[PDB]
């Protein structure tokens, strides 16, 4: 629960990061302080820009551009499949990835588009088996 | 790095939550998408409202009030010590708590005011020894 480590006098909390993400997912479930809608083939997904930027290289690049920083709606490539995006948005807020035989190619394609390198790497590992 | 668990078919990522928090702290360091300033005895601290709400019962209560939701400046009780607040803001974004003999009473008092129950519990454990 707590531990100490070398070269650093601070107390380390093992559960804090998971608790923060859990509470951020609760905010999303309740639509509290969400500040962007992502549009994927007419499907709409509400989210927190900071969480998107902390998980996706695409969204990091988008919202660090001064012109795009304050946009409230982001339209993605119409070829992106909404189910794949939904799975990856859930992953962002949960650390849990719904990979199945029937969606892994779409999830991998969407994670490459979003620049989510650890999801892509994981997809390639499962494909190889 | 990855694991499976019962009652849930999804892949579990062990490092994701810590990576999200690390990237959120990077956004804070760069002042990217910060949306509130907390004022503590004339000292000013920039932060992300969603992270404050995910860590502090006080900030959760504040920003779920419709009148206070869009405030850009929050003034805290003038008796709160800025060093204690700084230590707890760092903890929110890092899972690391700078507890010392010389600050533990102030940090505990500030964590009670912010309603950060796991920090308070930890302070009481260290005090008892
Ligand atoms: Cl990733
Ligand atoms: Cl806490």
Residue numbers in the entry:
A (entry chain A), B (entry chain A): -1 to 127
Task: Please share text taken word for word from the publication where this structure appeared.
Here, we report the functionalization of the BTB (bric à-brac, tramtrack and broad complex) domain from the transcriptional repressor BCL6 to serve as a promiscuous assembly block that may assist the crystallization of a guest protein. We showed that these can mediate the formation of a variety of highly porous lattices, and that a guest protein may be incorporated into a BTB-domain lattice by its genetic fusion to a corepressor peptide that binds to the lateral groove of the BTB domain with high affinity. We have shown that the surface of the BCL6 BTB domain contains versatile interaction interfaces with the potential to mediate diverse lattices in a range of crystallization conditions.
We sought to determine whether this sequence could promote crystallization of the BCL6 BTB domain when fused directly to it, and made a chimeric BTB protein in which SSDLYLRPG was covalently linked to its N-terminus (NCoR1BBD2-BCL6BTB). The SSDLYLRPG sequence similarly enhanced both crystallization and diffraction quality in this context, and we solved the structure of the NCoR1BBD2-BCL6BTB chimera to 1.6 Å resolution [Fig. 1(b) and Table 1]. Crystallization of both the BCL6BTB/NCoR1BBD2 complex and the NCoR1BBD2-BCL6BTB chimera was favoured in conditions of high ionic strength, and the crystals had similar cell dimensions and the same packing in space group P6122. A peptide molecule thereby tethers two BTB dimers together in the lattice [Figs. 1(c) and 1(d)].
